[PDB]
Symmetry: C2
Subunit: 241 residues, 2 copies
């Protein structure tokens, strides 16, 4: 269909949720990640359409720790990571799944997707799109109440030039949000490596979550898939797929 | 464990009791599965997930507003986003709360965790924030911003926490009070995003996390309905 063709034109390497979970769990099983000894953590957007990915991994690794917030940034931060690390089964490891997301419609249009019970779905990712509008308009001019969305604007500001010049800003936006996210994730992992001990590891899957209409499988574009030791050193890199 | 729970919180409900009671009441006000968006503000901690799953079985996939210690860190933008996802002519149901672990031995502030000899603190975030604000009291950047906000919101409770006979049973009550103030502010400020006959139903309280082979509990402190104007239409407490 139009939607699937659109998805694979923008991201030829995109996997279905089912393909992703099968691939990740199979690979990690060879490195001793099983259900009993793995704590799943996610950093995905607040938006309810991102839940299926959490459910799909949760079927394999159980109830997850949530690090995310608006646009999928790991707002739980250093304290959240340390808390999570203190929950890892003894002698076990963590698996962190993070990413931006974007909707694609029945017409193959990016930045929006039909939502249950609504005639108009609005923006997807709403947070990222609003932040994009704010930073690009500021550019083209060449308190916890709302603090998170403030941070999203802050982290997207370096991409303002990139966004304004983009052929399709709605495909470029989630790529930019992912790049901003992966930098923050790296920093948290570097700062929090003290919380992982001995042969404990952290496996990381990062990329772009693609939300399609409910009658269709969602997709995920993997950009990072690797394993880090307790010292913070990369031990395995599974990219490219 | 159960004795300890009812000792401190005599009105505690099991998760099952809670979901049955809430869904039964809201069905009388036209809340069903197709026309309700569920939103939660619960702690990041993986032990709070069962409550979301139990409500999720009734109302579907949920919007998350929460963060460390269960504070609605999604804030105004998060609420507005969520409101724009509500089924046409429908409503939202927001479930929020602090949480606390209680152990096999009936000790507050900790609960055995899957695969671990030692469970550590529960709520971890809240306990660490309580330590920081009490010690600072008794002395009469997104990287870690969220925990900074938890400390900020707990600071008014410093005296209460320092004078508590058991700070671990008192802490989730203070955190709930801090949360309910922020939730009310968000709902007041974001009232514009609810239109027409649309409503916001709110359930707030203290989530009690017990060992895995035991039902979790919830202490309801708030259960009410708000209209699109932000006025309270029903109070079930
Ligand atoms: Zn989003
Ligand atoms: Zn907690």
């Amino acid at each position: 269909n139009v939607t699937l063709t659109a998805v694979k034109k923008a991201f030829p390497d995109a996997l279905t949720n089912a393909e992703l979970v099968a691939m990740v769990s199979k690979r990690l099983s060879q490195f001793g990640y099983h259900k009993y000894n793995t704590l799943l953590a996610t950093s995905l957007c607040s938006d309810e359409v991102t839940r299926p990915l959490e459910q799909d991994f949760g079927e394999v690794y159980g109830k997850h720790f949530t690090m995310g917030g608006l646009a999928g940034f790991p707002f739980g931060g250093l304290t959240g990571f340390g808390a999570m690390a203190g929950h890892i089964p003894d002698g076990g490891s963590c698996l962190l799944i993070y990413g931006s997301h974007v909707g694609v419609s029945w017409e193959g249009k990016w930045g929006t997707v039909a939502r249950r019970g609504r005639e108009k779905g609005g923006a997807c990712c709403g947070s990222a799109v609003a932040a994009a509008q704010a930073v690009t308009q500021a550019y083209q001019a060449t308190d916890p109440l709302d603090a998170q969305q403030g941070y999203v604007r802050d982290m997207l500001r370096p991409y303002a030039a990139t966004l304004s010049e983009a052929e399709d800003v709605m495909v470029t936006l989630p790529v930019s949000v992912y790049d901003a996210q992966q930098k923050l994730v790296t920093r948290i992992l570097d700062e929090g490596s003290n919380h992982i001990d001995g042969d404990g590891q952290i496996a990381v899957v990062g990329g772009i979550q693609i939300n399609t209409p409910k009658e269709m499988s969602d997709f995920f574009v993997v950009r990072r898939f690797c394993i880090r030791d307790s010292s913070g050193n990369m031990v395995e890199n599974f990219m490219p797929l």
